[PDB]
Symmetry: D2
Subunit: 32 residues, 4 copies
Amino acid sequence: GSEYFTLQIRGRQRYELLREINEALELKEAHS
Amino acid sequence: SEYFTLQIRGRQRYELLREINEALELKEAHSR
Amino acid sequence: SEYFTLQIRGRQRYELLREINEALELKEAHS
Amino acid sequence: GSEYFTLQIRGRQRYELLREINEALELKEAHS
């Protein structure tokens, strides 16, 4: 789809955790 | 600036990551 | 029947998923 | 060989979600 959303994540460590999951899910969707 | 912006493609993934973020925040709030 | 064993490769991913799992369990308890 | 770690996850929907995230992270790592 063409819809983008933003989430404000408190703290660098939590951001990197969620960023990694987000990127991984995006990559998996692209590869499916 | 204590919050970092996560850009997410798709509403389902947004809702998932929002739910996880909320759970992580609650876990932090309850940490000893 | 409600428990499943998640098989994970590597300590880093284990710690990430363990943290999320614990946080989801806590959110459930407070829902 | 790989070093496996295990987590006990309560609930099939939660298990399948965390399994999906786990698999996506594995894919992202494999893709470098």
